[PDB]
Design a protein around this ligand. Structure first.
Ligand code: CLA
Ligand code: CLA
Ligand code: CLA
Ligand code: CLA
Ligand SMILES: CCCCCCCCCCCCCCCC(=O)OC[C@H](COP(=O)(O)OC[C@@H](O)CO)OC(=O)CCCCCCCCCCCCCCC
Ligand SMILES: CC1=C(/C=C/C(C)=C/C=C/C(C)=C/C=C/C=C(C)/C=C/C=C(C)/C=C/C2=C(C)CCCC2(C)C)C(C)(C)CCC1
Ligand SMILES: CC1=C(/C=C/C(C)=C/C=C/C(C)=C/C=C/C=C(C)/C=C/C=C(C)/C=C/C2=C(C)CCCC2(C)C)C(C)(C)CCC1
Lengths: 122, 57
């Protein structure tokens, strides 16, 4: 039931983050003395919004929607790092390594391509 | 023969060629409307409907 490369290749599923069934409304007990780790963090962008530049100083500087033009190349995956339980029982995630950037180009109304380095580096 | 300002009078008793002339006129006018629209679209800045609308451009 768990897919291989030959099932995945060319379908676009490789650009998706993995999901969880609706039943999984649980909780993960953080033992405050154990060391934890993120074995795989995946970020799959679904929406890119770009802020317009009103030549006025004022106006509503609203985020406008854009169309992706660089295809299913957008997800960050296989990101790892330590998850350090702090003094107060807050968890901090320190990114170490992975596929943590993707160049993305989106296009605005009118044809302006906007390139960005979509990243969670450090 | 015909002076310059009467060359089109050869169509007066020729309905098929009158229709042809009228079709060529309609072709030119429709072509004008398309080419004009495309020149405007090439030139129009749509980014500011408030202080730069179409009537300023
Ligand atoms: C809608 C426009 C239109 C139509 C349907 C007709 C139709 C006709 N003309 Mg008329 N004619 C026209 C406009 C038109 N003409 C104009 C503007 C002039 C002045 C130049 C003439 C001068 C004229 C003469 C002297 C004669 C005719 C004649 C005729 C008949 C035969 C075809 C011919 O020889 O034309 C000639 C074709 C032209 C003069 C075409 C004009 C070319 C202009 C420059 C446009 C060229 C297009 C170009 C790609 C755009 C340049 C853009 C620029 C900014 C660089 C036919 C009934 C003949 C006839 O039967 O007489 C008894 C004839 O002897 N016409
Ligand atoms: C629906 C409009 C319409 C139509 C179908 C006609 C049709 C005609 N006219 Mg008439 N006429 C009209 C409006 C019209 N006219 C208007 C508005 C005026 C006042 C300006 C006249 C004044 C007039 C005179 C004084 C005469 C005619 C004549 C004629 C006949 C011959 C035309 C010819 O061979 O010219 C050939 C024309 C050229 C070779 C070049 C003319 C180029 C002009 C001056 C500038 C360029 C025009 C440009 C290319 C297009 C602009 C179109 C514009 C509407 C935006 C033909 C039946 C003649 C006639 O009755 O014959 C017996 C004649 O003597 N017309
Ligand atoms: C009931 C039949 C019928 C219909 C539908 C029409 C319609 C028309 N005639 Mg008229 N006409 C008729 C009977 C008819 N006529 C008869 C019995 C005579 C005596 C022979 C005439 C004599 C006559 C003359 C001398 C002229 C007209 C013109 C026109 C046109 C002016 C509008 C135009 O060009 O729009 C612009 C066009 C469009 C937006 C697209 C056209 C859509 C059409 C219907 C597609 C044509 C496909 C069709 C299979 C081909 C033949 C159609 C024909 C019946 C008109 C219009 C198409 C004028 C013309 O031809 O102008 C260029 C013109 O000069 N008519
Ligand atoms: C209601 C709309 C309307 C009407 C009634 C007409 C009527 C006419 N057009 Mg058409 N035209 C129209 C809309 C119209 N046009 C539109 C929207 C376009 C696209 C821009 C055109 C493009 C067009 C072209 C390219 C041509 C015509 C021509 C004609 C004339 C054909 C009959 C003829 O032989 O006249 C004989 C000519 C006259 C009676 C002279 C009419 C003079 C007009 C009214 C304006 C005066 C112009 C002035 C002398 C010079 C102007 C500046 C110059 C630098 C161009 C007739 C007067 C044709 C023509 O004139 O052939 C000789 C022609 O070649 N028209
Ligand atoms: C899109 C395409 C656009 C193309 C447009 C083309 C434009 C066509 C150009 C037409 C120009 C026609 C001129 C015809 C000229 C010409 O043929 O004239 C002579 C002509 C007389 O013709 P007749 O009937 O004698 O016939 C002789 C025939 O051979 C004519 O074909 O009369 C008319 O044309 C009447 C208008 C007189 C207009 C001319 C008056 C001269 C006055 C001089 C003014 C200047 C001095 C002023 C100082 C203050
Ligand atoms: C063939 C063919 C085709 C194509 C088409 C085309 C491409 C067309 C175009 C056309 C066009 C694109 C046209 C245009 C036109 C224009 C015109 C027609 C104009 C005129 C003008 C005038 C007339 C002006 C004058 C004046 C001046 C200059 C100054 C002031 C005064 C006045 C206004 C008078 C197709 C593929 C579809 C299909 C079938 C075949
Ligand atoms: C079937 C066939 C064919 C066909 C042909 C055809 C049908 C063509 C026609 C053609 C044509 C039909 C052409 C036309 C031309 C046109 C022109 C040349 C125009 C011009 C215009 C102008 C000049 C413009 C201007 C303007 C305006 C008007 C407004 C806005 C501004 C502007 C400036 C843009 C062939 C041989 C291919 C091949 C074989 C078969």
């Amino acid at each position: 039931q768990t897919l291989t490369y030959d099932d995945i290749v060319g379908t676009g599923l490789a650009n998706k983050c993995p999901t969880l069934d609706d039943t999984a409304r649980g909780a993960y007990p953080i033992d405050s003395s154990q060391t934890y780790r993120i074995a795989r963090l995946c970020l799959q962008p679904t929406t890119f919004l770009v802020k317009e530049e009103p030549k006025n100083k004022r106006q509503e500087a609203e985020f406008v929607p854009t169309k992706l033009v660089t295809r299913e190349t957008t997800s960050l995956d296989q990101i790892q790092g330590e998850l350090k339980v702090n003094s107060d029982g807050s968890l901090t995630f320190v990114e170490e390594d992975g596929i943590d950037f993707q160049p993305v180009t989106v296009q605005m109304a009118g044809g302006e391509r906007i390139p960005l380095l979509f990243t969670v580096k450090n | 023969g015909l002076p310059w300002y009467r060359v089109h009078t050869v169509l007066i008793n020729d309905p098929g060629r009158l229709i042809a002339a009228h079709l060529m006129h309609t072709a030119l006018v429709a072509g004008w409307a398309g080419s004009m629209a495309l020149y405007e679209l090439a030139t129009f800045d749509p980014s500011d409907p408030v202080l730069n609308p179409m009537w300023r451009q």
